Amino acid sequence: AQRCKELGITALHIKLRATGGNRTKTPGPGAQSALRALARSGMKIGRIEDVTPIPSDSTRRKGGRRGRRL
Amino acid sequence: QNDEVAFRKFKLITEDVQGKNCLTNFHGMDLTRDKMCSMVKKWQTMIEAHVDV
Amino acid sequence: MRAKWRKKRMRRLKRKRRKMRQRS
Amino acid sequence: KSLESINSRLQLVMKSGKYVLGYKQTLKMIRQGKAKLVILANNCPALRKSEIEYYAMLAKTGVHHYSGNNIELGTACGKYYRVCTLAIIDPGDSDIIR
Amino acid sequence: TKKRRNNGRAKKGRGHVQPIRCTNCARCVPKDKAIKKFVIRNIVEAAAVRDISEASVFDAYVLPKLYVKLHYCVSCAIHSKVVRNRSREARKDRTPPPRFRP
Amino acid sequence: KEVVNKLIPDSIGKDIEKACQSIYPLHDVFVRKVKMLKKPKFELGKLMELHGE
Amino acid sequence: AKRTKKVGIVGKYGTRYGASLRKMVKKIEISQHAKYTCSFCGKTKMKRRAVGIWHCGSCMKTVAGGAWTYNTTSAVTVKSAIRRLKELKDQ
Amino acid sequence: GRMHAPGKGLSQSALPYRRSVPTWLKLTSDDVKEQIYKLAKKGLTPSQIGVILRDSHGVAQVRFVTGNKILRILKSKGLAPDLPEDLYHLIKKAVAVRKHLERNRKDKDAKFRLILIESRIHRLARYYKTKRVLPPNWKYESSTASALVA
Amino acid sequence: PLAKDLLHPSPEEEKRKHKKKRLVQSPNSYFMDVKCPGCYKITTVFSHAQTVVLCVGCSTVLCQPTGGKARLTEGCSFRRKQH
RNA sequence: GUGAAAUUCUUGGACCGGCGCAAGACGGACCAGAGCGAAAGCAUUUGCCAAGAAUGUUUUCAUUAAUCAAGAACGAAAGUCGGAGGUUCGAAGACGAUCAGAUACCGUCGUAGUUCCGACCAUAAACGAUGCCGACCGGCGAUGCGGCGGCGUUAUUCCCAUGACCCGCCGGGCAGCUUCCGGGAAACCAAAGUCUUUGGGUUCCGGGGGGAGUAUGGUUGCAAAGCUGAAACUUAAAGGAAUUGACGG
Numbered sequence: 008a009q010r011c012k013e014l015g016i017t018a019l020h021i022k023l024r025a026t027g028g029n030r031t032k033t034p035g036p037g038a039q040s041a042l043r044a045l046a047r048s049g050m051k052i053g054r055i056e057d058v059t060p061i062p063s064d065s066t067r068r069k070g071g072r073r074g075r076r077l
Numbered sequence: 078q079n080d081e082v083a084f085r086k087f088k089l090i091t092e093d094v095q096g097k098n099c100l101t102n103f104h105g106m107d108l109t110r111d112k113m114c115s116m117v118k119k120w121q122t123m124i125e126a127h128v129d130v
Numbered sequence: 131m132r133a134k135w136r137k138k139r140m141r142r143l144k145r146k147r148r149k150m151r152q153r154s
Numbered sequence: 155k156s157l158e159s160i161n162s163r164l165q166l167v168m169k170s171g172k173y174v175l176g177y178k179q180t181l182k183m184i185r186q187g188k189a190k191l192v193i194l195a196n197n198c199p200a201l202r203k204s205e206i207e208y209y210a211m212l213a214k215t216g217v218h219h220y221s222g223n224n225i226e227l228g229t230a231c232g233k234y235y236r237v238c239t240l241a242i243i244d245p246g247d248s249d250i251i252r
Numbered sequence: 253t254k255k256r257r258n259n260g261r262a263k264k265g266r267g268h269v270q271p272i273r274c275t276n277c278a279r280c281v282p283k284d285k286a287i288k289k290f291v292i293r294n295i296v297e298a299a300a301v302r303d304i305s306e307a308s309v310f311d312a313y314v315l316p317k318l319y320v321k322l323h324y325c326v327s328c329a330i331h332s333k334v335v336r337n338r339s340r341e342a343r344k345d346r347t348p349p350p351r352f353r354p
Numbered sequence: 355k356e357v358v359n360k361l362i363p364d365s366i367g368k369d370i371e372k373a374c375q376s377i378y379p380l381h382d383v384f385v386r387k388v389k390m391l392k393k394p395k396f397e398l399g400k401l402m403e404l405h406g407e
Numbered sequence: 408a409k410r411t412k413k414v415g416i417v418g419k420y421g422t423r424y425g426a427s428l429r430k431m432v433k434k435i436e437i438s439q440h441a442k443y444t445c446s447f448c449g450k451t452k453m454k455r456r457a458v459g460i461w462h463c464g465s466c467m468k469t470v471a472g473g474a475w476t477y478n479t480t481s482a483v484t485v486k487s488a489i490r491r492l493k494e495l496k497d498q
Numbered sequence: 499g500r501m502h503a504p505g506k507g508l509s510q511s512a513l514p515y516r517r518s519v520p521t522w523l524k525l526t527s528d529d530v531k532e533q534i535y536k537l538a539k540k541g542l543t544p545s546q547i548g549v550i551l552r553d554s555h556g557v558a559q560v561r562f563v564t565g566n567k568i569l570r571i572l573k574s575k576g577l578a579p580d581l582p583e584d585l586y587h588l589i590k591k592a593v594a595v596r597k598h599l600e601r602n603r604k605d606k607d608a609k610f611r612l613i614l615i616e617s618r619i620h621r622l623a624r625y626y627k628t629k630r631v632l633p634p635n636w637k638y639e640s641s642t643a644s645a646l647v648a
Numbered sequence: 649p650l651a652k653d654l655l656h657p658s659p660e661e662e663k664r665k666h667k668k669k670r671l672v673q674s675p676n677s678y679f680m681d682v683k684c685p686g687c688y689k690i691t692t693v694f695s696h697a698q699t700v701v702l703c704v705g706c707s708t709v710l711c712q713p714t715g716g717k718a719r720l721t722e723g724c725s726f727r728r729k730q731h
Numbered sequence: 732g733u734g735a736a737a738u739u740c741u742u743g744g745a746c747c748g749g750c751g752c753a754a755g756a757c758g759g760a761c762c763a764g765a766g767c768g769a770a771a772g773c774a775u776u777u778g779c780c781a782a783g784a785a786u787g788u789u790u791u792c793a794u795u796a797a798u799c800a801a802g803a804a805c806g807a808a809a810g811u812c813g814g815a816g817g818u819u820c821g822a823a824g825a826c827g828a829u830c831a832g833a834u835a836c837c838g839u840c841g842u843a844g845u846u847c848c849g850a851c852c853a854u855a856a857a858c859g860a861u862g863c864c865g866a867c868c869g870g871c872g873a874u875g876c877g878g879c880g881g882c883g884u885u886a887u888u889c890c891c892a893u894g895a896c897c898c899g900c901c902g903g904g905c906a907g908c909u910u911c912c913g914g915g916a917a918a919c920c921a922a923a924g925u926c927u928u929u930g931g932g933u934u935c936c937g938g939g940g941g942g943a944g945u946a947u948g949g950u951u952g953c954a955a956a957g958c959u960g961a962a963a964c965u966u967a968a969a970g971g972a973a974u975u976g977a978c979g980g
């Protein structure tokens with residue numbers, strides 16, 4: 008935000024992205040704090056959109072058919 | 078557009094620049110992710126069509 | 131043992147037995 | 155549906171009407187002027203097909219190009235030999251509308 | 253002993269149901285056996301809705317949603333507490349738990 | 355040009371929905387997407403009439 | 408009476424060259440020496456003259472086909488593809 | 499249930515209790531016989547003759563109005579088909595399936611259906627040879643059956 | 649109910665039962681007098697006709713075969729035969 | 732990337748963002764105790780090709796049927812052979828971690844394989860752990876298909892048809908809830924009921940636990956293996972369903 012302010016940018020569209028693909032679609036723990044910090048640091052907020060890569064169908068996900076055993 | 082809907086996006090690729098103006102032209106459009114995901118619901122059938130024209 | 135692994139052990143032993151008999 | 159219809163009508167031309175199977179007899183019937191429909195397998199040699207079509211134009215008779223071959227036209231006639239050209243003297247089953 | 257009449261899955265007149273991967277551990281689960289949760293969550297936290305709305309360039313801007321369908325194997329479901337073990341009589345009902353609107 | 359200005363309000367989807375009511379009722383009908391596949395040679399006069407007059 | 412249990416046409420090779428090689432060459436030799444139905448005259452007289460050349464006894468038509476079979480699956484798919492591309496090229 | 503399907507359907511025809519000819523049926527036995535003769539000349543199988551006669555000419559049962567069944571009438575006049583209708587249609591279906599199968603070699607479902615159809619053909623042929631409708635040496639050959647139908 | 653009268657079921661349930669499961673089998677179909685407009689002759693048509701029935705005095709269709717019952721063309725009249 | 736790391740990639744621009752190009756997989760959400768199929772199994776659009784159940788039927792034949800040793804077709808995945816293809820994933824293998832050890836679980840890479848065509852193999856918790864055909868024996872609300880009948884609403888049109896809903900009936904299905912029908916060792920099952928009040932037809936098949944699906948013979952297979960299949964000997968229990976308690980990282 009401070010770099011954008013000194014370079015002369017005032018508003019920001021938002022594109023939230025998770026890992027996507029055949030992996031998880033839920034955004035990580037940092038998205039909420041990053042967007043809130045951008046809001047509180049004076050930067051104006053415009054459109055917000057999810058751009059997570061969603062396969063119409065993907066290659067085989069890693070982990071095997073028995074998954075990640077823990 | 079002044080008072081149109083918000084879930085519609087346009088690509089607007091740039092072809093020619095003159096002076097300090099880049100000039101765009103239509104490249105495609107798409108519905109938004111949230112609108113498309115909200116439209117899909119259970120206990121109903123969706124029909125999808127595509128055509129090259 | 132697990133029954134599947136007893137089956138596998140029996141199969142290994144049977145291949146060894148077949149090889150020994152074929153050697154004669 | 156047209157192919158099964160023409161096969162059924164051909165089957166009923168057999169056993170109920172007068173016909174003739176083969177190139178030489180077909181030409182003989184045409185130039186006698188008593189051939190009402192000439193059926194040609196698509197396997198037919200091009201020169202023979204053109205000549206029979208010209209003969210039919212002279213005789214004012216119809217030519218149907220069977221969508222088969224000589225083997226399948228023989229089968230549709232119910233024979234165990236290939237027929238490549240055939241002529242219907244009289245149908246007896248309204249294959250040829252009056 | 254047969255624990256469940258439906259064998260823990262919804263397959264009734266099928267031979268084979270195609271598998272899906274557990275979103276938690278990437279285990280192949282039959283699609284009708286997996287626990288499905290369709291989460292429709294606000295794209296921003298309810299703690300940050302006010303800050304986002306104040307910093308918004310728009311006046312009547314409705315915040316977008318986040319639509320995610322989650323599939324769980326029963327192991328990850330039980331570990332993540334989305335489902336719990338129930339008594340022998342309580343296993344027999346299928347009504348989902350109340351939404352608790354108030 | 356008049357393809358773009360008529361897909362701006364999604365008139366195409368509206369008439370599709372109106373047409374399909376005699377088969378099965380439909381409610382959320384949109385031209386979900388359109389993508390450019392080929393373009394004709396970039397006439398600068400055509401670009402300038404698209405932008406200006 | 409049936410004379411061989413499994414070798415068939417490759418009984419002429421005796422015990423030589425290996426069972427798997429004889430099994431491999433058996434189907435090729437059968438299709439090589441088979442007589443195919445001529446698609447021009449309708450008779451079962453189209454047989455191989457040399458490698459890739461198939462000649463019909465009756466209508467004396469000669470065709471360029473496969474090495475061991477009258478036509479290859481590759482060539483059949485190619486002919487279908489060329490027909491599709493032609494009907495797409497014109498309108 | 500079905501012979502070669504796991505179906506247990508019930509769709510049939512409920513023949514009415516009144517065997518008498520309806521009073522409004524002006525058609526006489528010889529008239530119905532003439533109609534059957536004309537349809538058989540046109541090439542209709544007895545099932546189609548009955549369907550046409552019931553649909554258009556208003557005769558409920560040819561057996562009720564004439565006293566003899568349609569195939570009996572055709573055989574008495576001498577223009578009955580040499581093969582029975584149902585056996586002819588089964589052989590027709592087998593020929594069609596074989597024609598499809600010689601082009602589609604990977605259609606194992608079609609192979610299975612062909613086996614079922616040919617089993618039905620052989621059972622029906624055994625019955626007809628028992629009844630001496632068919633010659634005692636009548637055999638269904640898959641190769642030669644193509645020229646018998648359609 | 650343990651004392652249902654099987655010998656004398658009322659015509660309501662007698663009609664609602666399947667054709668074969670009635671006390672005595674009863675066809676649900678019938679025959680109808682059909683009147684094509686512009687024609688004088690009367691045609692006897694099966695209710696469940698599987699074939700396109702045509703007038704002999706005019707090249708016009710009287711019914712179109714459907715799944716269960718032939719659909720008469722519009723403008724054609726019809727009455728029952730002897731109930 | 733993980734619990735934390737590390738192996739690994741990075742001022743040679745890695746990751747990230749943008750625009751393109753190529754390839755091979757895969758057909759999300761819609762997707763359901765929904766459908767079809769003999770099962771195995773089957774989900775992008777459109778076309779072609781045959782096939783099929785159910786329904787409708789006052790069509791036809793007239794007992795042509797049910798189950799079936801031998802025999803035959805199909806038969807997930809893995810595996811085998813030949814030819815293409817090889818993006819992802821990933822047996823074997825390598826390394827990093829963890830550990831007392833760690834040939835593992837976790838991470839990075841990665842061969843065969845996974846994809847397609849042709850040919851084998853014929854096995855799965857191939858499951859409903861539940862033979863097929865036929866009859867009878869409760870209730871209820873749904874759902875799928877077909878047919879039939881009805882207030883109304885809706886789509887065009889000027890009206891009926893025809894679609895979409897609504898209320899019913901019938902038949903064939905996938906199931907569900909409930910019941911002192913009855914059965915059962917019980918769990919439970921409207922079939923696993925109509926069984927000492929024992930007989931509808933018919934096929935396969937079990938005889939305490941092990942040895943053992945082993946040895947041998949035969950037979951099938953390229954192989955792996957499949958089918959058929961003992962005995963000596965050993966043992967007083969092994970098992971099933973429920974109850975109480977104890978225990979649960």
Ligand SMILES: [Mg+2]
Nearest residue numbers: 076077327331
């Ligand atoms: Mg665990």
Ligand SMILES: [Mg+2]
Nearest residue numbers: 253254255256
């Ligand atoms: Mg247990």
Ligand SMILES: [Mg+2]
Nearest residue numbers: 267268857858
């Ligand atoms: Mg299974």
Ligand SMILES: [Mg+2]
Nearest residue numbers: 807808809810
């Ligand atoms: Mg396989």
Ligand SMILES: [Mg+2]
Nearest residue numbers: 811812813814
């Ligand atoms: Mg290979």
Ligand SMILES: [Mg+2]
Nearest residue numbers: 069820821840
């Ligand atoms: Mg990898």
Ligand SMILES: [Mg+2]
Nearest residue numbers: 798864932933
């Ligand atoms: Mg029995």
Ligand SMILES: [Mg+2]
Nearest residue numbers: 938939940941
């Ligand atoms: Mg024992």
Ligand SMILES: [Zn+2]
Nearest residue numbers: 274277325328
């Ligand atoms: Zn999981």
Ligand SMILES: [Zn+2]
Nearest residue numbers: 445448463466
């Ligand atoms: Zn030739």
